[PDB]
Symmetry: C2
């Protein structure tokens, strides 16, 4: 009654929903459907409508006034013009006088023209009319989001250590590199739980190998780190290296587990190893084979992983390379100025992540071949699903850390996502903030961005402000590209400021983890737009640089360089709280309305809502050492908080022993 | 006395200053000077210091927290990481407990590490200790800037028609193209005074020609437009096409007016026309010759010009093309994967605006040969100088519209600048805003940005917001790149809103013109940071998204997509004014403090200071038709305003009849 499914043509089964909804019979209940030019849904919005959703996509929380195309794309330059990033999250809510949610279950290129062409017109369109459209009804947008969260299945739940702080760099290669990271944090008493291992840890970029010269006793080294409460989190990519003798490659060939050209040859895509093949993520037996290979790492002590390049990213194909070389030969011989350097330049760019390559290979789904572009947005999803389903077979009682770059709705059951290759730009703090609630609407709660900025060179103050937002995001990882200025906390003067900010994270871990688990187990949102909590406050509904967290707090990060504070709007009385660098917590009651608040570079702010409180632990240097027996309670007198707490390792969620009421 | 000059080595004479300052012989008064590896000035800032200046450079009004390299560079992607744009404006003010200004008079690559390396450290460095450093003392930053304005000479002053609205696009080619722009504005009663003619109006991109097929009788087409109060503003580029029979080329070759390679041959750089030569802008005889060629256009009724590619931009040189072809040949025949596509791609990138090419040509300076890289930052400056000096020769009493892309301090006397190739990004509204006061500090008052965003695709709301900031910038011009979504005001629905917004411009022209003229004639600022007007207010000094204009008003544009208002800080009581879509003017007294103000898309807001007022004309569709006889005064009863007005055409600036005192 509250969700209806409208079927068009013969849709590929994405497995996004875990609940079966019957196909509806009536006319489509909103706007107009046309099949003249492929498929197009057209809706005239009211002037005051706000459009929420789209998970990981560009720009802001209110999606009105631009174009967004669902088409998982490896693009490391997240500027305002960009229409497609890594995630295809096809859920939107029109919120206004007439309110409703739509989920377009369609696995290929889907274009949301949300007031781009004409301010009052929403147009969603695709090439083929083979899809299911879920219409979700409800009193308000938050109600609709919650009904959607129910039908898509419970969100991935990480192990508790994954609520600590993590440090990654594309470049850590040797034991010395990793030991220097360990020392730089530990000797400076800066809290940390995780060090990420990027591609250089493998033998020549081969999946499910480790470099034999650098790590001849990898299990010893994993334990060396683990004994210090540092969990190594290695990367796995989609491309399996073409190499004679390499068992992952031999088996994929012999057993037909790779994506193939139409003629049945194994399709070649160059990535880090050079020539690779792509496991056929849409073939259940190839999925199981690939997933089971994680055993190689789990058996050495590894308790978490991350996946990149799973769009799948393609540096070039063999076809593209040959074309590019042919064109280069012509340009080289050109003595008549007919081939301009810009055309040579365009061809070199065109061979990367080419739409032509995405039509050159196929998925074998139970004997039936489907051209990749027709199901492009399912690849990363199904790669992460291969890993999650494997973890269940390998150790069903245990939570593993898992997150991915590319994703589609349904993947949120098996892994988190990080926001991909961002930049050391102040505008990317705000971008990180704004994606959060949208990711929550689509079931992806375990999420975060590369703190300090992945690409380009950070500054001390930019990294501090990034970190102060990261305090609140379930994934809190400082990560960086090769060639960039080093951005570990210990690379800067006055390291005490970094200690202070990260201490605030650890002091809030019990609260944050508790809210995560409550949200996940109840199909609810960890971050929410203000309008979800204050539906009747016309000013609240349009705030976009603050977020509600749980039912107790609101966050409002500073994202302007040189700012000593920022403006906020409080839709009710709250206590303005800051974690101070001397270890103390300042508190000030602020009334409903507009305020300017002072927030220094080494201070972490939040607001506790009227009639609420939160527990705050003493600072500890790893998750395991956090003392949750004797936590102080901050907020309003006479209020109470329900703390969710478990062993953070296993899957025993239902128990009454997991909850205790704390009373201020 | 409050300015001293410190000379190192044998500086090249840039002519930035018009006032002579004696060489100081005492100790350098601030920080430390090193000559150990080229030149470095190093200063330890107090934690509260603000650093102003740097004219057109990246990021914010307070320059602390990043690295700025003065190195005029053709880069059309103005993202936060960029260290060099088009402008080389070597003037900064340290403002705090200790306050002083520095102008670094040096014509080559100059690095300002302003808290990038260490937050507390300002370091300014260059490869050769051959420069003058001017140290300016004063009570505060505003006083230091006025002293600098005096010594660099009076800023360029435009004709009054240049305070209308202007429209341009890379693509307008034929007479019908221009007629349709004219028709699109005039038939919808949208005020306009100027249409810009980009490179397609030339015959095959040849400077100082006109496409004689499309314009058989150009003077009559100029008149056709002028009778409608529409003045065509044609572009001229740095590169003169290599073509036998083309007079400009033949004259430059014959008389050795082009920049030469080391062997004496005329240096070849490819730009729009394919092969070109650059006029030797540092050679006085070459400057006079090139500047004299503007006669070709003036004689046909043209009253204004713009200059681009004056860095000078180089798509490739003959040397660089040959290197890239040789590389391409190697790539093409590579079978063993030794030459990666990304290397090929990097070579093609490397040949554009190449540091190597800037070392391949020379200027003939009064007989002395100087390698171009040594004086790189003077080229665009001298090209605009050439136009300006020729105008004074052609008609000394007439003001011409003139602005350029690249510049160096000194150029501000001969023309304005526009802010180059920006983007249809919301963040570029704020970038347009922030650059303004900094440009004023450096003498560049006639400035503005491409309204709506030059590159990428705009949206209706973004254009309206850019325009509402355009209302206040001396250059108010909607301009777009080829291939972009069309962004003339008539391309959008509900064009009344576009009328309303531009109407506000024309209603304020008498005031804005008045303030520009008073400022220009007195070596003062048109736009000021709040800290210049309210130096004792610790809140005001840190505001960057509001500016003071003149002595009467404050501006505070909306720059967030979907926003229906914004936060503002008023350092004193002001009247919050809005030009309303129906032609009325709303008025609200707001006290000193933090406020949220509602500004709809089709409303243009401003604030009138306590005890001040401004004259407001009735709306008119061109500058010539504005009725200034009995303008309405808006603001505080009992205040007065001094109105400057002249004929707008000539240079009769020192008349007492020019000033009229208006009392509310
Ligand atoms: O494993 C290294 C790196 O991979 C991913 O980012 C890789 C990219 O590098 C670029 O320079 C390229 O321009 C992008 O298009 C790439 O995908 C991953 O996102 C990152 O976290 C890893 O460190
Ligand atoms: O203004 C012309 C501009 O066009 C853009 O397409 C180029 O990439 C810039 O480098 C160039 O100067
Ligand atoms: O001339 C074509 C283009 O060249 C460059 C200029 O910055 C831009 O304004 C112009 O449109």
């Amino acid at each position: 009654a509250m969700i209806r499914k409208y079927r068009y043509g013969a849709p590929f089964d994405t497995e996004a929903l875990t609940e079966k909804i019957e196909t509806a019979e009536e006319a489509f209940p909103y706007g107009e459907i046309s099949q003249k030019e492929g498929f197009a849904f057209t809706y005239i919005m009211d002037e005051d409508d706000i459009v929420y959703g789209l998970g990981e996509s560009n720009r802001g929380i209110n999606k009105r006034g631009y174009c967004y195309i669902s088409n998982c794309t490896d693009d490391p330059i997240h500027t305002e013009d960009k229409r497609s990033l890594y995630g295809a999250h096809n859920f939107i809510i029109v919120s206004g006088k007439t309110t409703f949610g739509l989920f377009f279950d369609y696995p290929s290129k889907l274009t949301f023209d949300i007031g781009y062409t004409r301010m009052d017109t929403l147009k969603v369109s695709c090439e083929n009319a083979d899809l299911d459209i879920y219409v979700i009804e409800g009193e308000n947008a938050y109600d609709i989001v919650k009904q959607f969260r129910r039908v898509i299945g419970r969100s991935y739940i990480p192990p508790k250590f994954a609520f600590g702080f993590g440090q990654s760099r594309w470049g850590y290669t040797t034991k010395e590199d990793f030991r220097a990271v360990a020392k730089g944090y530990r000797e400076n008493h800066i809290p940390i739980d995780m060090i990420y291992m990027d591609i250089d840890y493998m033998q020549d970029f081969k999946d499910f190998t480790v470099n034999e010269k650098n790590f001849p006793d990898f299990p010893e080294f994993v334990k060396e780190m683990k004994d210090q409460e540092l969990r190594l989190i290695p990367i796995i990519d989609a491309g399996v290296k073409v190499e004679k003798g390499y068992e992952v490659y031999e088996e994929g060939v012999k057993n037909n587990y790779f994506c193939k050209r139409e003629d049945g040859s194994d399709f070649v895509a160059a990535v880090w190893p050079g020539d690779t093949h792509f496991p056929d993520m849409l073939n259940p037996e190839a999925r199981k084979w690939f997933g089971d290979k994680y055993r190689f790492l789990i058996d050495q002590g590894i308790e978490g992983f991350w996946n990149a390049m799973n769009e799948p990213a393609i540096f070039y194909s063999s076809e593209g390379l040959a074309e590019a070389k042919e064109f280069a030969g012509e340009f080289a011989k050109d003595t008549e100025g007919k081939i301009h350097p810009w055309a040579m330049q365009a061809k070199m760019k065109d061979i990367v992540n080419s739409p032509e390559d995405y039509k050159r290979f196929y998925h074998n789904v139970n004997g039936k071949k489907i051209r990749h572009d027709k199901v492009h947005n399912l690849f990363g999803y199904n790669m992460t699903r291969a890993a999650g389903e494997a973890f269940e077979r390998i150790d069903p009682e245990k939570r593993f850390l898992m997150f991915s770059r590319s994703s589609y709705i349904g993947m949120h059951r098996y892994g988190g996502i990080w926001m991909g290759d961002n930049k050391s730009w102040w505008s990317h703090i705000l971008l990180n903030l704004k994606m959060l609630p949208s990711l929550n609407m689509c079931g992806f709660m375990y999420t975060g961005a590369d703190l300090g900025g992945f690409g380009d060179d950070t500054t001390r103050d930019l990294l501090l402000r990034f970190l102060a937002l990261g305090v609140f995001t379930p994934l809190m990882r400082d990560h960086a590209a090769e060639g960039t200025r080093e951005q570990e906390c210990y690379q800067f003067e006055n390291i005490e400021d970094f200690r202070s900010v990260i201490n605030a994270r650890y002091r809030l871990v019990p609260y944050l983890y508790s809210e995560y688990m409550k949200a996940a187990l109840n199909d609810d949102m960890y971050f929410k737009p203000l309008g979800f909590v204050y539906p009747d406050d016309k000013m609240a509904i349009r705030v976009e640089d603050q977020l509600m967290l749980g039912n107790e707090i609101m966050i409002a990060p500073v994202y302007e360089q040189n700012a000593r504070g920022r403006y906020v709007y409080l839709p009710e009385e709250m206590k303005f709280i800051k974690f101070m660098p001397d270890g103390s917590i300042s508190e000030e009651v602020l009334e409903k309305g507009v305020h300017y608040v002072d927030v220094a570079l080494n201070e972490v702010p939040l607001f506790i809502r009227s009639g609420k409180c939160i527990p705050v632990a003493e600072a500890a240097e790893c998750v395991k050492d956090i003392d949750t027996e004797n936590m102080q309670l901050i907020g309003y007198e006479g209020s109470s908080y329900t703390l969710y707490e478990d062993d953070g390792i296993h899957k025993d969620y239902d128990k009454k022993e997991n909850y205790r009421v704390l009373t201020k």
